[PDB]
């Protein structure tokens, strides 16, 4: 029913280079400030899904150097991705997170022994998240999972704020989506009501993880080409949350009684993860990548002149601290100064592409129509993607066949 | 007496794919909650054995594409296991256990408090277990052991809370059993009467270990095909337990005298194990496997027309925090906030199988009858395991010969 | 003077397998308890040298499958070691020890207290050792060296608690000996009098190390066939030793002055070792080994018709907690619970030997007489070992000519 | 437009050795001390860039041992750098910095103490940096990115203490600059107003990280021949910052109320980077480095008769503490003792160089004139960098062809 793409497509001996030049993202690492609903400084963090929608030149109307090979009848031209390059330029740095109002009341390890200060309140606490190093390339945007509060419970329950059902919501991973965490990839804006169980960056958003199961389980494999993953975490401190337990522990396991007791502690225990050491040797970027054979039936074919590259990197997530003076004084005064958190994130996207052709037969037309008809009216023989927000890059009028003028071209001519 | 399975079976070049699709397991990570004497939410944790009884159709009545090679007389068909994929889909995360009342008398790491305890010194303390990865595959379910209260003491001794005898008790691992921590493989319900010397998750239960010796010591090798384990742990903090010691240290080894002393301290020394860091490179799942050579005399042949695969993993076993609001107020009170734990765990079972035949001879009949006669009534030429609670999964009517439509089939054709 | 074995031995193509079956050991880790002066429970710990003394069948009187190769005149045949496997099966776990009264004066990581102690500034302190793995094999037991007090010092001195002389006492090893920690191979029963500077499990006796630079210097190589060892060692806490300093620091290096000073504090600085993590790639266990070419002049020769295998591994040596009820009360009380420390330890020895023969010339007879005459009266062409305590194990009448029924046999016949 | 150097140049079989001998540097590592407004002790630190201008003799003016290959007409001779060696000679040591008056508000990790800050809450803090090994070489001075204050604020704003426009500035690296640490490559002297939020060594100066992206995207790659980096870092503490928050947290994300609140805690969260372990396999120095194919189109051709090397090696950068006695007394009084604090670093620069000829064709002359006019008036067929502070080293009249009498030369002749 479904056949590999290389059975019908044809690879030519034509290679072009594209470069995104300098890409910069500067903004506050925790929340997007806006004065009179005008976001001057948006959300910019090293803990952010970077989804780049690359638009491509039409190979059919492009100034092809050898138009003799091309035939307007029964032959169309598409771009095929060959090599990729993600140019990080910022130095190494671990991001810092936290929240001033969090439920950090007992230190179970008893080195600190916080002892749950009196009355229901909060306290300031901060930590770092895990080392996450992920990159994805594809002709379709990635799909990732997260659990959340979906449909209500079975039958007709009567309750007031009990445990909701858990549903595996699978959503397209767009720019503005929050990375996985050691606290679980939930919809904390809705599922969590305190807005105080996690640091400020993830309390009002929806963390989600790429569900590789459905990702690879696609019949056509349009949603992936190849994935690179490195993850590192280890729990550095153990603690509990306050509040009451709606699912109490049975008495059959715990013996209670006597003074200084008969009130059980919280059965809710979580941790603070840490990434430990970063290194340049463990880096997966600033190095050429070659697409020998994709796992799915899509050997780098960019249908519809659209490309999707998503990266998350924590090695370049260092948080910048700024200070300024309102006034000045003879002595050091706390009132004269204002403090700001600014984050930067630098990107280069460098690509080498190979020209691809196709011969139109009746079964070929039927297959290419069944898998996607939108491209079929594109070649002219309501995209839902306009609603979602991505980081768009335009690589039109930037393709160059003079690949020897670029370092990626040199590395490409090094091997074949 | 015992001959290799390769002597009599015949391997044919017919291969079939199986996929159990999106398998889910959501439940409370510490204990199985009971509401109205029924398991509304069962206990699901990453610290728990996952025992997968996968059932397969009858090849004798299966609609084979080529039945001409088959003979209804002196030939039967049975699948042979060829390739495994256990598709965990979780973000890599570590879980937390603990006890609100554990025998945590005093930390002893650098300094010690006064010797003799008071009435009740049993405090809130949490921890995490050792880092475990384990996969077992075979046709017969594994047997594992734990240290338990065996038969009563020899001769006729009279006792009152004396030390019970230790017995290496052997039982088949069923689903619901939980993985060995850094504490020790034993029965906490029987051999421990405190119920306050271990975190609450395994305080009432038993944790067991695979007997790779007696797996190997079996004559036919039906209890394994291959096994992979990766285990790491280091001790973090040391402490002592309250209560008197049944075996005081001899006076020939210690000198007592005067005040603040002549009262022996706690001789109990127990640790806080930790799983250290986790990395994607040390992960031993989510990668294709090939059965080249079984150590025993069962090269993937699924006797009984079924297969047993058991996995444990803690790298993808983060805990999940769930809060709702019973009420609300103008200010912040946890009286308006109710708390829960949940844990999710997902699996794909991507299997590839080889079709095989047998030349049924008289000596072959005798040998196959001696190793297991149950299959001899099965081909038609009282299971005690029905009492045991497994994780049954059905892959009948889900096989396919068109292996190119599946991700594992591409790797299968990639090699050989 | 001493010639290699390979000149005169004759290796036939005959291989045998022996199985030691399930060997178990239970006992208290710190001291052997004695009730009415009998060993009710032996001292069993994971920090104990395991010296398995394997007795072998008489090969000349053994029932050979083909005895026509052998000639009773001018020829004798003995066993030859080829492949040994140590089947551990305990879950991975670190042993934690300590001393209920340890001479711990002050912490010196970051801050020091007053240097002058009181009458007894001694506290319960618990700690772990290094992690060690040691395996060696041979036909004679190894020699452990340790520094100790031997004869009197030089001249004829009269002294009151002066420093005893240090002698490198080399004694034969035995089962139940203590492994070396970071504190060194020390005869604590003699040179140490406090009995309060080192934890319980090794304070009452002497620990030893193998003399590799004597065994290599031995002309025979009888004790060693090969050895594999791993040591991991890192210091976590530093501390000072209370008590009077028998060697006061010279005034040339230290300038004293003013109040709360001019009295030299504790000038002794010893550390707390630890073994850090235990990783599943770091054991020398549960994997076969092939004797290719021994370093010594004994190519697996079972001289004396006996075998000596010495192993120790603290990686699978966690301590087991035992708590029992004496009465039943409504609340939790300390006096209603009895506590015990019990440790378990299991082994299986998988052996495969080669059948080797000797041509008996007069030069050969004289040479082997110079090697070990006891075997010469054994063939009939006062052992001091009976005084010491070895783990005697009988492998007689357990042989097997076939190797296809044993996993060690399969792993052997996979190669060559 | 631009072609590779190896297309037109011709290589000869002549090699010459260059040795910088002992290059020593001693100086105060935090700031240069000045008396009478002169730099008696320059600021010399292990976290400072080492930028060496290697000056070379003219091959055109050199007295060649073989001038037969030379032709004064249409042929100019230039040096070509082939082999590199940075001879460090210091024992390994961690660099340490700190600051006596830093806005170390509150240690926040294990718990927090939210209180109203006073006028001053600064405390002395000690801190290490990220561990960094880096060598850059070429014929053009390498640059680096650093963040700073760009143009004035957009629109027509009136403000007193707002966040300034933060802009990337590309600045060429000179000697005396400091390597980036965990706090970010930027100008603290202008943008950090307190002069107190970092250690004093990086308060009034600017650390800047070299931009590999402009070493790649340049049309010639003159700034870089080949580069080595190895950088490791991990966090050890978390703390917030004193002073007002000029960008307050949004109200819809944080719930606040009741007593002890309506005065928010410090939302600024930062960290303590550290270099972790430094090992003897970690150094990418004290070893020969051979050029075979530079990434750009400049294969070791040092244009302008000059050589550029910039290194940072913080691994062996332990700090110097020196004692002296202004006076003396009977007892230890601090006023008798004065302390100075320094830093020492040593370098050798072992080079092997190669000669290349070139045919001065008219199109080649035009290509080099577009490449560089300075070499055109150099050969005789206004450096802007004279203002900058460099480390000039004179390798003129030091070359030799007796490579057997030198270490690196015999490494070179050991193969090819």
mmCIF file of C-alpha atoms in Angstrom, chain D residues 112-406:
data_model
loop_
_atom_site.group_PDB
_atom_site.id
_atom_site.type_symbol
_atom_site.label_atom_id
_atom_site.label_comp_id
_atom_site.label_asym_id
_atom_site.label_seq_id
_atom_site.Cartn_x
_atom_site.Cartn_y
_atom_site.Cartn_z
ATOM 1 C CA UNK D 112 14.955 30.438 51.483
ATOM 2 C CA UNK D 113 14.855 33.266 54.004
ATOM 3 C CA UNK D 114 12.740 36.039 52.533
ATOM 4 C CA UNK D 115 13.341 39.182 54.548
ATOM 5 C CA UNK D 116 13.372 42.900 53.962
ATOM 6 C CA UNK D 117 16.890 43.901 52.865
ATOM 7 C CA UNK D 118 18.812 46.635 54.619
ATOM 8 C CA UNK D 119 20.910 49.394 53.128
ATOM 9 C CA UNK D 120 23.818 46.992 52.594
ATOM 10 C CA UNK D 121 23.832 43.202 52.778
ATOM 11 C CA UNK D 122 27.015 42.491 50.828
ATOM 12 C CA UNK D 123 29.276 39.680 52.024
ATOM 13 C CA UNK D 124 32.606 38.250 50.966
ATOM 14 C CA UNK D 125 32.190 35.402 48.486
ATOM 15 C CA UNK D 126 34.724 33.121 46.811
ATOM 16 C CA UNK D 127 34.163 31.552 43.429
ATOM 17 C CA UNK D 128 35.894 29.618 40.654
ATOM 18 C CA UNK D 129 35.219 29.732 36.934
ATOM 19 C CA UNK D 130 34.441 27.330 34.126
ATOM 20 C CA UNK D 131 37.366 25.176 33.063
ATOM 21 C CA UNK D 132 38.504 26.200 29.597
ATOM 22 C CA UNK D 133 41.205 25.055 27.180
ATOM 23 C CA UNK D 134 41.462 26.969 23.917
ATOM 24 C CA UNK D 135 43.976 27.563 21.137
ATOM 25 C CA UNK D 136 43.363 29.687 18.036
ATOM 26 C CA UNK D 137 45.926 30.220 15.252
ATOM 27 C CA UNK D 138 46.116 32.036 11.962
ATOM 28 C CA UNK D 139 47.408 34.973 9.963
ATOM 29 C CA UNK D 140 44.648 37.428 10.977
ATOM 30 C CA UNK D 141 43.709 38.480 14.527
ATOM 31 C CA UNK D 142 40.707 36.521 15.805
ATOM 32 C CA UNK D 143 37.613 38.354 16.985
ATOM 33 C CA UNK D 144 34.976 37.685 19.598
ATOM 34 C CA UNK D 145 31.385 38.511 20.355
ATOM 35 C CA UNK D 146 30.417 40.396 23.465
ATOM 36 C CA UNK D 147 27.145 41.847 24.650
ATOM 37 C CA UNK D 148 26.925 45.526 25.411
ATOM 38 C CA UNK D 149 24.952 48.734 25.253
ATOM 39 C CA UNK D 150 24.089 49.439 21.636
ATOM 40 C CA UNK D 151 22.515 52.639 20.364
ATOM 41 C CA UNK D 152 20.156 54.834 22.357
ATOM 42 C CA UNK D 153 16.685 53.530 23.162
ATOM 43 C CA UNK D 154 14.130 53.517 20.356
ATOM 44 C CA UNK D 155 11.214 55.959 19.912
ATOM 45 C CA UNK D 156 11.743 59.179 21.964
ATOM 46 C CA UNK D 157 11.953 57.834 25.518
ATOM 47 C CA UNK D 158 12.352 59.545 28.869
ATOM 48 C CA UNK D 159 13.477 57.070 31.516
ATOM 49 C CA UNK D 160 15.651 56.717 34.618
ATOM 50 C CA UNK D 161 16.971 53.198 35.060
ATOM 51 C CA UNK D 162 15.370 51.084 32.350
ATOM 52 C CA UNK D 163 16.811 48.052 30.604
ATOM 53 C CA UNK D 164 19.271 49.384 28.004
ATOM 54 C CA UNK D 165 19.265 48.096 24.415
ATOM 55 C CA UNK D 166 21.501 45.042 24.612
ATOM 56 C CA UNK D 167 23.481 44.511 21.414
ATOM 57 C CA UNK D 168 26.112 42.142 20.066
ATOM 58 C CA UNK D 169 29.436 43.869 19.397
ATOM 59 C CA UNK D 170 32.077 42.076 17.336
ATOM 60 C CA UNK D 171 35.459 43.136 18.709
ATOM 61 C CA UNK D 172 38.907 41.857 17.801
ATOM 62 C CA UNK D 173 40.676 40.068 20.650
ATOM 63 C CA UNK D 174 43.851 41.669 21.982
ATOM 64 C CA UNK D 175 46.247 40.553 24.672
ATOM 65 C CA UNK D 176 45.140 41.287 28.209
ATOM 66 C CA UNK D 177 41.497 40.405 27.610
ATOM 67 C CA UNK D 178 39.846 37.851 29.868
ATOM 68 C CA UNK D 179 38.214 34.590 28.846
ATOM 69 C CA UNK D 180 34.468 34.167 29.222
ATOM 70 C CA UNK D 181 33.294 32.689 32.516
ATOM 71 C CA UNK D 182 29.917 31.287 33.505
ATOM 72 C CA UNK D 183 28.402 34.768 33.819
ATOM 73 C CA UNK D 184 28.288 35.598 30.109
ATOM 74 C CA UNK D 185 30.526 37.249 27.517
ATOM 75 C CA UNK D 186 29.704 40.931 27.926
ATOM 76 C CA UNK D 187 30.990 44.287 29.174
ATOM 77 C CA UNK D 188 30.532 44.437 32.932
ATOM 78 C CA UNK D 189 32.338 47.789 33.222
ATOM 79 C CA UNK D 190 29.448 49.587 31.507
ATOM 80 C CA UNK D 191 26.377 47.389 31.880
ATOM 81 C CA UNK D 192 26.919 46.142 35.444
ATOM 82 C CA UNK D 193 26.416 49.356 37.380
ATOM 83 C CA UNK D 194 27.328 48.236 40.919
ATOM 84 C CA UNK D 195 30.844 47.138 39.902
ATOM 85 C CA UNK D 196 30.044 44.569 42.569
ATOM 86 C CA UNK D 197 27.988 41.735 41.061
ATOM 87 C CA UNK D 198 30.991 39.724 39.801
ATOM 88 C CA UNK D 199 34.556 39.179 41.091
ATOM 89 C CA UNK D 200 36.822 42.217 40.815
ATOM 90 C CA UNK D 201 38.865 40.553 38.072
ATOM 91 C CA UNK D 202 35.831 40.820 35.761
ATOM 92 C CA UNK D 203 34.088 43.940 37.087
ATOM 93 C CA UNK D 204 35.936 46.745 35.306
ATOM 94 C CA UNK D 205 36.928 44.599 32.320
ATOM 95 C CA UNK D 206 35.157 42.736 29.512
ATOM 96 C CA UNK D 207 35.246 39.005 28.895
ATOM 97 C CA UNK D 208 34.407 37.984 25.347
ATOM 98 C CA UNK D 209 33.948 34.590 23.754
ATOM 99 C CA UNK D 210 35.411 34.006 20.276
ATOM 100 C CA UNK D 211 32.850 33.711 17.494
ATOM 101 C CA UNK D 212 33.450 30.562 15.456
ATOM 102 C CA UNK D 213 30.628 31.656 13.153
ATOM 103 C CA UNK D 214 32.645 34.590 11.839
ATOM 104 C CA UNK D 215 35.724 32.402 11.607
ATOM 105 C CA UNK D 216 33.603 30.283 9.266
ATOM 106 C CA UNK D 217 31.393 32.730 7.348
ATOM 107 C CA UNK D 218 34.315 34.962 6.362
ATOM 108 C CA UNK D 219 35.141 34.578 2.644
ATOM 109 C CA UNK D 220 38.767 33.568 3.274
ATOM 110 C CA UNK D 221 39.122 32.254 6.808
ATOM 111 C CA UNK D 222 42.284 34.242 7.489
ATOM 112 C CA UNK D 223 41.414 34.566 11.179
ATOM 113 C CA UNK D 224 41.559 30.807 11.767
ATOM 114 C CA UNK D 225 43.706 27.897 10.634
ATOM 115 C CA UNK D 226 42.578 25.278 13.163
ATOM 116 C CA UNK D 227 41.089 25.595 16.629
ATOM 117 C CA UNK D 228 40.982 23.455 19.756
ATOM 118 C CA UNK D 229 38.560 23.893 22.633
ATOM 119 C CA UNK D 230 37.600 21.795 25.635
ATOM 120 C CA UNK D 231 35.357 23.429 28.219
ATOM 121 C CA UNK D 232 33.611 21.943 31.236
ATOM 122 C CA UNK D 233 31.415 23.555 33.866
ATOM 123 C CA UNK D 234 28.805 22.647 36.455
ATOM 124 C CA UNK D 235 26.852 24.603 39.044
ATOM 125 C CA UNK D 236 27.434 24.285 42.776
ATOM 126 C CA UNK D 237 25.286 26.939 44.471
ATOM 127 C CA UNK D 238 22.167 28.992 43.868
ATOM 128 C CA UNK D 239 21.426 32.447 45.219
ATOM 129 C CA UNK D 240 19.282 35.485 44.548
ATOM 130 C CA UNK D 241 20.380 39.100 44.173
ATOM 131 C CA UNK D 242 19.746 42.057 46.439
ATOM 132 C CA UNK D 243 18.144 45.238 45.162
ATOM 133 C CA UNK D 244 14.896 46.181 43.497
ATOM 134 C CA UNK D 245 13.305 44.231 40.652
ATOM 135 C CA UNK D 246 12.783 46.680 37.808
ATOM 136 C CA UNK D 247 10.586 44.219 35.882
ATOM 137 C CA UNK D 248 8.087 42.906 38.451
ATOM 138 C CA UNK D 249 6.534 39.459 38.121
ATOM 139 C CA UNK D 250 3.075 39.317 36.495
ATOM 140 C CA UNK D 251 0.105 39.252 38.836
ATOM 141 C CA UNK D 252 -1.829 36.502 37.043
ATOM 142 C CA UNK D 253 0.977 33.966 37.566
ATOM 143 C CA UNK D 254 1.679 34.476 41.289
ATOM 144 C CA UNK D 255 -0.780 34.467 44.191
ATOM 145 C CA UNK D 256 0.296 36.581 47.159
ATOM 146 C CA UNK D 257 -1.343 37.830 50.317
ATOM 147 C CA UNK D 258 -1.538 37.970 54.110
ATOM 148 C CA UNK D 259 1.244 38.969 56.495
ATOM 149 C CA UNK D 260 4.988 38.773 55.741
ATOM 150 C CA UNK D 261 4.068 39.431 52.093
ATOM 151 C CA UNK D 262 3.007 42.060 49.510
ATOM 152 C CA UNK D 263 6.789 42.656 49.374
ATOM 153 C CA UNK D 264 7.968 40.163 46.775
ATOM 154 C CA UNK D 265 11.132 38.116 47.021
ATOM 155 C CA UNK D 266 14.101 38.446 44.706
ATOM 156 C CA UNK D 267 13.087 36.953 41.361
ATOM 157 C CA UNK D 268 16.691 37.251 40.159
ATOM 158 C CA UNK D 269 18.274 33.795 40.291
ATOM 159 C CA UNK D 270 21.930 33.095 39.497
ATOM 160 C CA UNK D 271 24.494 30.369 40.081
ATOM 161 C CA UNK D 272 28.068 29.416 40.940
ATOM 162 C CA UNK D 273 29.828 27.794 37.973
ATOM 163 C CA UNK D 274 32.789 25.527 38.620
ATOM 164 C CA UNK D 275 35.435 23.719 36.595
ATOM 165 C CA UNK D 276 34.861 20.304 38.269
ATOM 166 C CA UNK D 277 37.718 17.800 37.859
ATOM 167 C CA UNK D 278 40.822 18.552 35.805
ATOM 168 C CA UNK D 279 42.731 15.483 34.649
ATOM 169 C CA UNK D 280 46.007 14.709 32.892
ATOM 170 C CA UNK D 281 44.243 13.392 29.805
ATOM 171 C CA UNK D 282 42.215 16.602 29.665
ATOM 172 C CA UNK D 283 44.889 18.909 28.244
ATOM 173 C CA UNK D 284 44.876 19.527 24.508
ATOM 174 C CA UNK D 285 48.408 20.937 24.778
ATOM 175 C CA UNK D 286 52.032 19.835 25.257
ATOM 176 C CA UNK D 287 51.560 17.740 22.116
ATOM 177 C CA UNK D 288 52.351 18.426 18.447
ATOM 178 C CA UNK D 289 49.568 19.646 16.173
ATOM 179 C CA UNK D 290 49.879 19.070 12.440
ATOM 180 C CA UNK D 291 48.095 20.860 9.616
ATOM 181 C CA UNK D 292 46.796 18.825 6.694
ATOM 182 C CA UNK D 293 43.589 20.567 5.584
ATOM 183 C CA UNK D 294 42.415 23.794 7.178
ATOM 184 C CA UNK D 295 38.652 24.266 7.021
ATOM 185 C CA UNK D 296 38.861 27.565 5.160
ATOM 186 C CA UNK D 297 40.757 28.347 1.982
ATOM 187 C CA UNK D 298 43.984 29.233 3.793
ATOM 188 C CA UNK D 299 46.112 26.115 4.236
ATOM 189 C CA UNK D 300 48.578 27.440 6.773
ATOM 190 C CA UNK D 301 49.715 30.302 4.542
ATOM 191 C CA UNK D 302 50.737 33.103 6.900
ATOM 192 C CA UNK D 303 50.138 36.253 4.891
ATOM 193 C CA UNK D 304 51.784 39.486 5.909
ATOM 194 C CA UNK D 305 54.883 37.685 7.258
ATOM 195 C CA UNK D 306 53.133 37.358 10.626
ATOM 196 C CA UNK D 307 51.740 34.613 12.837
ATOM 197 C CA UNK D 308 48.817 34.748 15.265
ATOM 198 C CA UNK D 309 48.298 32.487 18.244
ATOM 199 C CA UNK D 310 45.840 33.049 21.086
ATOM 200 C CA UNK D 311 45.552 30.589 23.960
ATOM 201 C CA UNK D 312 43.751 30.292 27.265
ATOM 202 C CA UNK D 313 44.714 27.466 29.645
ATOM 203 C CA UNK D 314 43.041 27.882 33.020
ATOM 204 C CA UNK D 315 43.741 24.296 34.102
ATOM 205 C CA UNK D 316 47.165 25.103 35.568
ATOM 206 C CA UNK D 317 46.310 28.527 36.939
ATOM 207 C CA UNK D 318 46.575 28.220 40.715
ATOM 208 C CA UNK D 319 47.022 31.519 42.510
ATOM 209 C CA UNK D 320 50.122 32.754 44.309
ATOM 210 C CA UNK D 321 50.138 33.658 48.000
ATOM 211 C CA UNK D 322 53.289 35.251 49.381
ATOM 212 C CA UNK D 323 54.246 36.137 52.946
ATOM 213 C CA UNK D 324 56.588 38.711 54.435
ATOM 214 C CA UNK D 325 57.240 40.221 57.856
ATOM 215 C CA UNK D 326 57.061 43.979 58.189
ATOM 216 C CA UNK D 327 57.810 43.489 61.896
ATOM 217 C CA UNK D 328 58.003 40.613 64.376
ATOM 218 C CA UNK D 329 56.968 39.918 67.959
ATOM 219 C CA UNK D 330 57.091 37.200 70.599
ATOM 220 C CA UNK D 331 53.652 35.801 69.753
ATOM 221 C CA UNK D 332 51.832 35.388 66.457
ATOM 222 C CA UNK D 333 50.268 38.771 65.747
ATOM 223 C CA UNK D 334 48.751 39.445 62.342
ATOM 224 C CA UNK D 335 50.132 42.999 62.115
ATOM 225 C CA UNK D 336 53.657 41.559 61.969
ATOM 226 C CA UNK D 337 52.693 39.801 58.733
ATOM 227 C CA UNK D 338 52.035 41.201 55.266
ATOM 228 C CA UNK D 339 50.735 39.174 52.337
ATOM 229 C CA UNK D 340 50.972 39.703 48.593
ATOM 230 C CA UNK D 341 49.109 37.769 45.935
ATOM 231 C CA UNK D 342 50.356 36.991 42.433
ATOM 232 C CA UNK D 343 50.125 34.653 39.445
ATOM 233 C CA UNK D 344 52.772 33.023 37.243
ATOM 234 C CA UNK D 345 52.441 31.433 33.791
ATOM 235 C CA UNK D 346 54.970 29.985 31.344
ATOM 236 C CA UNK D 347 54.836 29.296 27.617
ATOM 237 C CA UNK D 348 56.966 27.768 24.899
ATOM 238 C CA UNK D 349 55.998 28.158 21.238
ATOM 239 C CA UNK D 350 57.496 25.331 19.174
ATOM 240 C CA UNK D 351 56.771 25.698 15.454
ATOM 241 C CA UNK D 352 57.717 23.999 12.201
ATOM 242 C CA UNK D 353 57.416 26.153 9.066
ATOM 243 C CA UNK D 354 57.380 25.400 5.348
ATOM 244 C CA UNK D 355 58.287 27.408 2.242
ATOM 245 C CA UNK D 356 55.988 27.966 -0.729
ATOM 246 C CA UNK D 357 56.641 29.735 -4.012
ATOM 247 C CA UNK D 358 54.076 31.530 -6.136
ATOM 248 C CA UNK D 359 53.962 32.534 -9.797
ATOM 249 C CA UNK D 360 53.014 36.207 -10.030
ATOM 250 C CA UNK D 361 50.575 36.052 -12.901
ATOM 251 C CA UNK D 362 48.598 39.217 -13.614
ATOM 252 C CA UNK D 363 45.273 37.667 -12.615
ATOM 253 C CA UNK D 364 47.053 36.184 -9.589
ATOM 254 C CA UNK D 365 48.448 39.628 -8.725
ATOM 255 C CA UNK D 366 44.928 41.068 -9.017
ATOM 256 C CA UNK D 367 43.531 38.229 -6.879
ATOM 257 C CA UNK D 368 46.098 38.908 -4.156
ATOM 258 C CA UNK D 369 45.514 42.673 -4.426
ATOM 259 C CA UNK D 370 41.809 42.100 -3.805
ATOM 260 C CA UNK D 371 42.906 39.644 -1.100
ATOM 261 C CA UNK D 372 45.375 42.000 0.568
ATOM 262 C CA UNK D 373 47.071 45.173 -0.705
ATOM 263 C CA UNK D 374 49.463 45.211 2.263
ATOM 264 C CA UNK D 375 51.456 42.253 0.960
ATOM 265 C CA UNK D 376 51.635 43.998 -2.431
ATOM 266 C CA UNK D 377 53.442 46.949 -0.957
ATOM 267 C CA UNK D 378 55.335 44.519 1.293
ATOM 268 C CA UNK D 379 57.029 42.631 -1.544
ATOM 269 C CA UNK D 380 57.821 45.914 -3.387
ATOM 270 C CA UNK D 381 57.370 44.136 -6.711
ATOM 271 C CA UNK D 382 49.524 51.398 8.137
ATOM 272 C CA UNK D 383 48.453 48.618 10.500
ATOM 273 C CA UNK D 384 45.283 49.565 12.424
ATOM 274 C CA UNK D 385 46.349 47.042 15.075
ATOM 275 C CA UNK D 386 49.343 49.075 16.277
ATOM 276 C CA UNK D 387 47.036 50.819 18.755
ATOM 277 C CA UNK D 388 46.010 47.532 20.384
ATOM 278 C CA UNK D 389 47.936 45.770 23.156
ATOM 279 C CA UNK D 390 49.525 42.531 21.915
ATOM 280 C CA UNK D 391 52.209 40.093 23.066
ATOM 281 C CA UNK D 392 54.996 40.640 20.539
ATOM 282 C CA UNK D 393 57.489 37.780 20.254
ATOM 283 C CA UNK D 394 60.546 37.971 18.015
ATOM 284 C CA UNK D 395 61.356 34.740 16.200
ATOM 285 C CA UNK D 396 63.584 36.505 13.672
ATOM 286 C CA UNK D 397 67.221 35.306 13.422
ATOM 287 C CA UNK D 398 66.163 32.224 15.407
ATOM 288 C CA UNK D 399 65.245 29.806 12.608
ATOM 289 C CA UNK D 400 67.234 26.678 11.820
ATOM 290 C CA UNK D 401 67.081 23.756 9.404
ATOM 291 C CA UNK D 402 68.655 21.347 11.921
ATOM 292 C CA UNK D 403 65.344 19.772 12.887
ATOM 293 C CA UNK D 404 67.089 16.641 14.167
ATOM 294 C CA UNK D 405 68.628 18.867 16.856
ATOM 295 C CA UNK D 406 65.147 19.909 18.004
#
